[PDB]
Design a protein around this ligand. Structure first.
Ligand code: AP5
Ligand code: MG
Length: 212
């Protein structure tokens, strides 16, 4: 399956993506994860990305398109399919992506658009805690771990309230035209994101199994 998963910050993309990958073995391509990995290893692009990410701003299109194109061009993608997560994030990236996918013969087959009340997002990101090794995300209220030990968790630097508030403003402005772009193509599946995590997934699982 050639898939995009989309949604505002905190809408549950990563949470759902982890469940999707566990069942379908599509390649999870998360620009967020790619940036944070680079940042942790202090690579050149990581140092660049940090500058934008810590302020809740978009990393420039040029670098972003490049790292996604690089991953999409690998030899596994055509056979296994992929799940693009957090990209495209501007209409410019959408246009760039579409041309690349057509060239590689891996055109999108579906968009999973997770719709969530934006009034819920500040609390979702404020209460987020992340397991170190896996990067599995939890929520101190809505999705807490069974036995919390501090050595296994941390908080994302961009989950500070002021950064979250900036991230929401930036992505609310860019988001609508991208959804419209793919809705026009008949590829969008709107998901009720205002449910329990497992209910959101069961909805997504039904959509994905009904593809092809
Ligand atoms: N293409 C691009 N172009 C330019 N720049 C780019 C870029 N891509 C990335 N960047 C840069 O990198 C930065 C970060 O990108 P990125 O990592 O992609 O941030 P994001 O897009 O905002 O996504 P998030 O990880 O913040 O939210 P999520 O939907 O995955 O939430 P989660 O599932 O963990 O869940 C959130 C929390 O809510 C909880 N939760 C999940 N589901 C539910 C539920 N159903 N009910 C209650 N709580 C829930 C979770 O437990 C968790 O605590 C960007 O700000 C940008 O600077
Ligand atoms: Mg995520």
């Amino acid at each position: 399956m050639n898939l995009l998963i989309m949604g505002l910050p905190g809408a549950g993309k990563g949470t759902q993506a982890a469940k999707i990958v566990e069942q379908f073995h599509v390649a999870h391509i998360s620009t967020g994860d790619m940036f944070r990995a680079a940042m942790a290893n202090q690579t050149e692009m990581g140092v660049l990305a940090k500058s934008y990410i810590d302020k809740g701003e978009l990393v420039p299109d040029e670098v972003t398109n490049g790292i996604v194109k690089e991953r999409l061009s690998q030899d596994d993608i055509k056979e296994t399919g992929f799940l693009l997560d957090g990209y495209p994030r501007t209409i410019e990236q959408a246009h760039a992506l579409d041309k690349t996918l057509a060239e590689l013969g891996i055109e999108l087959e579906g968009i999973i658009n997770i719709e969530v009340n934006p009034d819920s997002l500040l609390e979702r990101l404020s209460g987020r805690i992340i397991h170190r090794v896996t990067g599995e995300t939890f929520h101190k209220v809505f999705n807490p771990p069974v036995d919390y030990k501090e050595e296994d968790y941390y908080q994302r630097e961009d989950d500070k309230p002021e950064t979250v508030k900036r991230r929401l403003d930036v992505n609310i402005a860019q988001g609508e035209p991208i959804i419209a772009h793919y809705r026009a193509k008949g590829l969008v599946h709107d998901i009720e994101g205002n449910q329990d995590i497992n209910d959101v997934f069961s909805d997504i699982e039904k959509v994905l199994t009904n593809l092809k």
